Each structure stands twice: as C-alpha cells, then as structure tokens.
A = this chain, B = another copy of it.
Amino acid sequence: ITPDRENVVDFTTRYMDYSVGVLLRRSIQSLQDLSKQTDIPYGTVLDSAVYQHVRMKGLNPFERDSMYSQMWRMINRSNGSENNVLESQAGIQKVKYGNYAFVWDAAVLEYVAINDPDCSFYTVGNTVADRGYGIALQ
C-alpha cells in the first residue's frame, strides 16, 4: 500500500503487515546496527520499493534520521550499479558466497533462512507499522 498507488488501484485493509529484514551471513542484530557502518555493502533489488523508500527517506531533511542518510550513500554508489543485485535470488546467493547483506521483506527471508538445512543464513528485521500488503482491485 501506497497513497500514490491508491489513486490508481483500490486496496483492502492489510492482511499481512509490511516488514523489512535483512539476510545476513551466519555482528548485525538489528537494522539500526546495519546503517551505522558501511563496512558491510548492502542493497536490495535495483530500482524496487525498498530502494525507492531509502531514496525518499534518505533525501528528506525534515524527517532526518541518520540511518537513511548512512544507508542512502551506500545503496546509491555509482547511481546504484555498484551495490544492488538485479535479482532477489542473486542477492541470496551473494550472502552465501561473499560478505553481503540482502535487504528484503523479513517474512520471505525469515522463511528461506529457517528452512536452510545448513543454517548458514541469519535474519533480523523490524516490522513496519501503517504499511502493509493489501489486495488490489481495479
């Protein structure tokens, strides 16, 4: 759900609350900790919702909280061709074989990391209130 999107599609009330999480290699216990250093390169799908929210929030000087400032420089280096994956699958694999964090919906990542029989993934995530997924109609 987005109020912009609401002008072009009718949404229900949420049935699932939006949540953003991060799939981690098996010292980040929170997204709060993850924004405070850039030592771990991070990303999500290039040009996705998660991308554009970091951009919106990260370019806002009214709603300045330094997490999105610290995050927004990392996610957009070289306009975002240096530290975003072009597949969600490509990001899961990058955590598997390299030091990387792939930011996505906590609820998808929670499922992959907890059904990995290696137990080589770890997932942490905060839920996002007043945001959620809804059914769209014409």
Chain A residues with a Cβ under 8 A of chain B: 29-33, 63, 65-66, 77-78, 81-83, 126-127
- Chain B residues near A66 (CB-CB < 8 A): 29-30
- Chain B residues near A126 (CB-CB < 8 A): 63
Contact of A78 among B33, B63, B81, B82 (CB under 8 A): B33
- Chain B residues near A31 (CB-CB < 8 A): 78, 81
- CB distance B63 to A32 under 8 Å? no
- CB distance B63 to A29 under 8 Å? no
List 14 contacting pairs A-B, 8 Å CB cutoff, sorted by A: A29-B77, A29-B82, A29-B83, A30-B66, A30-B77, A30-B78, A30-B81, A30-B82, A31-B81, A32-B78, A32-B81, A33-B82, A63-B126, A63-B127
- Chain B residues near A65 (CB-CB < 8 A): 30
- Chain B residues near A83 (CB-CB < 8 A): 29
- CB distance A82 to B127 under 8 Å? no
CB proximity of A43 to chain B, nearest CB, Å: 11
Closest B residue to A29 by beta carbon equals B82
